[model samples]
Target: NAKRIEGLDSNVWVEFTKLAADPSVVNLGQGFPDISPPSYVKEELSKAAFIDNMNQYTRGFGHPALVKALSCLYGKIYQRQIDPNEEILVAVGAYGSLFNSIQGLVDPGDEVIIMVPFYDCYEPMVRMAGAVPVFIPLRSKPTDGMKWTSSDWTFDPRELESKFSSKTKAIILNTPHNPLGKVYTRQELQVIADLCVKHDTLCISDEVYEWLVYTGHTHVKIATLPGMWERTITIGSAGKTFSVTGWKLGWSIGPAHLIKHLQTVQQNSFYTCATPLQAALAEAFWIDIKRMDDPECYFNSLPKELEVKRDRMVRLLNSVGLKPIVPDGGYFIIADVSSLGADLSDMNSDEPYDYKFVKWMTKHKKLTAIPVSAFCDSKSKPHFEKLVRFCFIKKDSTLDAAEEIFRAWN
Candidate 1:
C-alpha cells in the first residue's frame, strides 16, 4: 500500500486516549484541562450560540473582530502596532497554524531544527512538508537534589549553533514547552535570535502555554526582541489560553512578509475556521485585555490555580517514590518511574520501559500517564525510558483520585 503517512501512525495521544477512556482508569495522560473557562467566556459562547449569523462563515483568514482584538492585545504586549488584516491569521488550532507554517515556508530538502523532547507534532509536520527535521536535545544538568526542575533542561550553545546552516529553513521554538514545561529566559532567546539572524532562518515561536508560566519565571515572546519581529511567527492558542480546548481557535502573529504565505496555505486547506468560536474568542481576548491588571482576570488567576495544582501533583508523585520533575510552567509533569519497582526483565514486548510501565499502570494500577520517551527522538529515547508524564490541569477531585491511587500503591 502507498503510504505517505508511514511514520505518523501509532500516536502517543491517540493510543493512550483509548486507554485513558476506560471507565475504571484514573486518566492523566492528555494535556487538556478537565475544567471549563471562566463564566464570562461561557457567557459569550452562549450569546454566540443564540445569534443567527454567528453560525455562518467568518472572514476567510479570520473573523474581523477576533483578529482586531488579537491585534490590539498583542500590540500592547509587543509594544508595536499590528495590522490585523495583513499580519494576523486564525487557524483551526495551534496545531493547524504550525502545519500551515511548515507547509507554506518549508521546501523539500530544507532543514528545520527541532529541539528534542519536543511537542511530537513538529517532527511529523516537518517530515510531511518534505523537509528534514534536524534534532538537538536540551541537555540536562546533573542535580544534587532528589527531585529535578525544568530549568535542568538546557541547550548547548555549540550544539545549537552547529545545527544551523544555509540549508536551515526554520527553527520551531516552544517556550514553556510541553512535556518538560521549560520556559526559555530572555537571554536564552537572545542566543536563538542571534543565530536566526546569522543564518537567515525563520523562527516559529509556539507560545501556546505562554500564560501557564509559574512564579519566578517569565514567558518572553521572541517576536518582542529587537531583531525577531520580522523573522518570527508567533503562535497562540485560544484553547490553551481560555481553558476551552474544544473551541479550537488559534492564530499566528508575524510581519506581513511571512504571514502572507501562511494565509495562502490557510486558503487552500481549511480556508475558514468556525465562525461562532472566533466571535467567542474575540470576546474572551477583549475581556482579558481590558482587565490585564486585575488579579481576578483569567490570565492572572488561571496560572495561580495551575501552579498550586502542579505543586500538589509533584508532591504526591514524590511522596510515592516517583522522582517528579517540578515544572516552572505548563500543566504536565514528567516523573522518573525507575524507582516505582517495575520489573522490566520479564516484559516480552519491544515497547520502551516507560511505555510498558505506563500501560501496566493504566491497566493494573488503574492510573494513566504518557511515556516521556515518546517525546524524544530514537537515540534519546533510552535516556528518557524511566520517565512518565502526567497532566495536572485537572479537577481537584481528579488530582485527589490520582493521589489515592499512588497512596494505595505505596
Candidate 2:
C-alpha cells in the first residue's frame, strides 16, 4: 500500500469487467477486437514456437529482428531513415512504452500535460512516477447537426498553452484519440508543436491507433514536424496494428537520446517482451511492408473494414435515439444516452449516473458498455455522465446480436 497507489485502487475496467463475468453478457465495453487478425499473424506465432532460438531472450532493449523490422516499417511511414539499434525500444505493450517513457524521464514534481477523456492508465502511471498530471479537457465545437463527430471536439489554444510553464516536462498526445476518436489534424498539431518548441517540452505521442484512420483522415506524426523529432517519443502497438490485442507487443521510436531512457526503463523492468511474440510480429511487419501499397495489406485493409463497422454502429445507436459522436478514426464510438431518459433512482446517490446506468444495463439486461467519464479525470467526470463508449472492432455476428438485445427491449 504505497502512497503512489493510494487513490488509484478504483478502476472502471475492473468494476465493469466483473459485471461481464456472466459471459452471457454482450460486451461492447473494451477496445479489444473480437475479430481475429489476418491468418498470417497467428501462423507466424505458431511457426516461431517450434523454432529453438525464439524461445530464449535475444536482446534486452529489443529483439534484433523485430527492431530492424520496426525501423524499416516506420522509416517508410515517417519518410525518414531510422536507426534500427539506436532509435527503437520494444516493450510488453504500448502500455509498457508509455510506462517507460513517463518513468524514465519524468521527475518528482515535474508537470506532465494530459488531454482529458484519456486512456485511464495514464494518470496512475504519471502518479507512480511522482509527477503531477495537469488535466485539460477539449471543448465541444459541435457542427450543429443532430449527430456529432469527434473532429468537432477541439481544445482552445489559449487554454492549452496556459497550462504549460517552467516545470512542464512533457505533454502526452493521443491522436486518433481514444473515447472521442478525434484524429488531430496537421494544423491542429502545429499549434501544440510550436508551444512545445517554445517551452522546450518533450512529447509522448501515443499512436497505437495509427493504422485505424478512416476514409477522410490521415495520421500525422508530431515527430515529423520541423523541430519535433529530437523531442518526441512516438509509441505504437502491434496489437492495434494487427488486430491481435492478446499478443501484447509494442514499441517506441525517437532520437537515441530520448529512446535510451525508455531503454533504461525496459532493462530495469520488463527486460524484454516475449521473444516468440516479438519474432512473430517481426514476420507480420515484414509481410505487410512488402505489400505496403496494395489494398491486400492488413494495415491498409483493416481500416477500410473497420470504417464500415464504425458507420453501422453509428446507425444502430441513432436508431435507438442515442446520438453517436461519429468517430473520424479508431474503432471506439461513444453515444449520448441522456436522450433515452432511463431512470436510475435506485442506484446509490454517491455513484455517478453513467456508472450505475451502465452497470444496471449489464447486471439486468446482459448488455454492457464503458462509462465515458471513466476516460476523464475527477473534475470533468460529471460533465461526461450522459455518454457511454462501445467498441466496434467486433465480428458482425456479435454486432448483430447487440441489435437483438436492443430490439427486444424496445
Candidate 3:
C-alpha cells in the first residue's frame, strides 16, 4: 500500500468545482480571475513561440532572463542582492515549489508549524513527506462594534510561541492568505520571524498574492526580516502576478545552499517547467521590471481594480445579510452565514455546516462557493463552519450575474 499518500485523495477544489460546473450556477468558488492578463504578457508569449531557441529546454533551475529579471525586481524590494544563478528555482507553479520545500528540507518525525485556515495543501504536503504538522488557529478578535476585516484575524503571541520547539523544522507563512485574504503587517511578521529564529526553523513564505493587495494593506515579506533571509524561502508566482493562472509558473528564492536541495528534488522529478512558458514569463518580467514605478504597470493597476471588485462584492453580500469579513489584500472575500437562517437540516449532518450550506446554495439557489472550514484543521472546523469563501476576481459580467442571483434571492 502507498502509505505515504493514502488519505490525500480528497480536495475541496475538486469537490466544489464540480458543483460549480452546472450551467446555471454562478461560480465564484475558485481563486482564478475571469479577466484576461495584461496585453504585454500575452504578446510576449506569442513572440516567444516564434523564437526557435525558446522551443527547447533552457536551464534546469531557471531561465537566465527570468531569474535576472526576478533578481532585479526583488533586489529593489528586499534592499539586497539576489543571486540569479544560485538562489532562484523556477517551478511549475507555486504548488511545485511548496512541494519541493517540504520534500527537500523536512524529514520524518520533524514537526512543521502551520497557521489555521491555511492554503489547505500545506498539511497534506507536510504529511505526505512524513512530517508532523502542528496547527495554531489565527483566532478572530472583536472589531469593537465595527464590521470585521481580515485585520481582525490574528494570532496571540503567547499562542504562537507555544507552537515552536527544537523539533520544529519549518513554518509555512502565506501573506495575503487565501480564503480570508489577510495580509500580515510588518509588525505581525516580526513575531513569526522571531519564533522561526528562536526555533532555528525555516519560514517558507508564500507570497503569490503579493501584488493583489488592497488600499489599506501592504504585503510584507517575512524573508525580509532581520534574521529571515538566511532561514526563509520566499515563493512567488507569475500566475498570481500577471493574472495568468494557466501559465502555472512560479519560483523559490533563498540561500544557495537551501536552493541546492530544492534543485535535487526538481532534478529528479518534473526535470524543468515548460520552456516556452518560462521564456515568455521571462520576457513578461523584464517588461514589468522596466516599468516598476509606472502607475500603468500591471502590478499597480491590478490591485486598484481588485480593490474595487472586493468592495463591490462585500457591499453586494452585505445587502443580502451575509456579514462579510472584508479582505485587506488579495481577491477572496469570506462571509459569515451563521445567521442566514436557511433550513439545512436535511443536508448531511456529518458534514460541516459551511459545506452543507455551500452545496445547498449551489444546487438550489444557483450560486456556488467554497466552505471556509475546508482550509482549517479538523479540531477547529466548528469554529469556522459558519463561514463561506467567495472569489471576487470574476469579470464584471460574471459578478453582475452573481448580483442578479443575490437580487433574485432577496
Candidate 4:
C-alpha cells in the first residue's frame, strides 16, 4: 500500500501463524502460551469488564489504578520510588509501547542500534520512522558437549561500542531476548550501560520477560543503573506476565521527559488503552505484589514450571536429532536442524532455506516452529538457516503431542 510497507509484509510471525492456524498443525510458532493463567486473573478480568464506569475512557496516559499498581511493582523491583502519574504510559501491549518509543524519539537520519536475531518488528519500526537501524549480532561459541546453554551467547564489547556514533539516537535492548532466551547478566548490561552513557544514546529496554527468569539467572532493569534512568525507557507486558496475551495491556516507565514524548505519540495515534483491561491488570498487579514472597505466587512458580517445559523440549528435540540450545528465561528455544538433512528441494530455493524447512515441517511433519533466520538481517539470514525456534510455553498435553510427533518421526 505504501513504500514503507514494502518488504514488511513478509513477517515471520504473520506467515508462520497462518500455517499454525490449520486444524492439523501443532502450533509452536508464536511466543504466546497455550496454557491459561491463574483463576484470579480471569476473575479480575470479568469483574473489571462488568464494572459500569469502566466503559468510558480513563486517563489519556494511563489508567489511575493501573499506573499506580505498575509504579508500586517497579519501585520495589528497581529500589527507586516511581511517580505513577508522570513516569508510566500504558499502551495496547509491550509491542505498542516499543512502537511508541521508536516512533516518538527517532528523527529522520538518526541511527538506532539493534542487536541481531532481534524480535522481527524492531528493524521495520526503525525504518518506518525514517531512521536507520544499525544491527550488531550476539555471537555464540561452539560448546564442548552435547548441551548448549543460552549463556554462551555473548556480545562483543568492541563491536557494540563501534555501532554507536554521533548520529546514534537509541539502542533497543531485550533481556531474556526472544528466539534465544538469553538473559543478560548485570555485568553484561554494565558493558552496554557504560556505552550508552559514553555516547549519550537513549536505551529502549524491552523487558516484557522480566519475571520469567530461571534458576541461576536474574533479569536486571537497565534504568536502575546510574545515569541510565534519565535516558532509558523500560517497557513491560502484562500479557506475557499473566499468560493472557489477549489482554493487550503493557506500559512504559522512565523519566518524565522521555515518557512525555511517548505520551505525545500515543495521543496522536491510539489515545488510551482499554479501560476494562487496565482495571483488571491493576487488580492483578496488586495481587502479585501482595503474594511476592509466597511459593504459590505466579512470579515464584512460573519459572519453576517453565524450567520443566524447557527441559522437556530440549530432550525431545535432542532425541529427534536436533540440538536445542537450552534457554534460561523466556518461552522459546532454538534448535540446530542441520543434522536432520531434511529434503527441501521441492520448495522455492529463492526463499530462505529455514523458511522453506518450516513450511515443509508444518505441512508434512504436522508440527510448526519459527525459523531462526527470520530474526536475522537479510544478508545474514542464510547463515542461520540451520536453526529453528520453538516455544516451550504450551500445556503438558500440547507438548506431549509434539513429543508424539518426534517419537514417531524417529
Per-candidate Cα lDDT values, in order, are: 0.89, 0.89, 0.89, 0.88
What value does the lDDT take at residue 97 in candidate 3? Answer: 91
Model 2: residues with Cα > 4 Å off, grouped in runs: 144-146
Writing each residue's lDDT as its tens digit, candidate 1 over 1-410 gives 33556677667667666677788777888876887678889999889999999999779999999999999998988898999999999998999999889988999899999998989888888888778899998889987577589988889988899999899999999988888999899888999999999998899999999899998899899998888888999999999999999888899999999999999999999798998888888998898899899998888999999899889988989887888889888888989888767865676888889988987887778998889888987888987788899998898888888888988984
Q: lDDT for model 2, please.
A: 0.89
Expressed as tens digits, the lDDT of each residue in 1-410 for candidate 4 is 88766666766556655787788778888877889888898998899878898978899889999899989988999898999988999988998999999988999899999887999899999898889999888889877576598998888999898999999999999998998899998888898899989988999999999889988898888899988999999999988889999988889999999999998999999898888888888898899889899988888889889999998998999998888999879989999898878888877568777788888898788998889988999777866888899998899999989988999985
1-410 per-residue lDDT for model 3 (tens digits): 59998899998777765687788888888886889889988898899899899899888888888888898898888889999988889988999999888889999999999998999999999999999999999898889576789999999999999999889999999998987899999888999998888888999989999998887788888888899888999999988999899988889999998989999999999877777888888888877788889888888999989888888998988988999999889889999998888879897579999989988898888998889999998998998899999998888999999999888885
On a 0 to 100 scale, what is the lDDT of residue 243 in model 1?
94
State TM-scores per candidate.
0.97, 0.98, 0.98, 0.97
Superposed on all Cα atoms, the candidates' RMSDs to the truth, in angstroms, are 1.4, 1.2, 1.1, 1.4
Model 4 steric clash total: 0
Q: Give the C-alpha lDDT of model 4.
A: 0.88
Give per-residue lDDT, candidate 1, residue 130.
79
Number of colliding residue pairs in each model: 0, 0, 0, 0
Q: TM-score of model 4 relative to the true fold?
A: 0.97
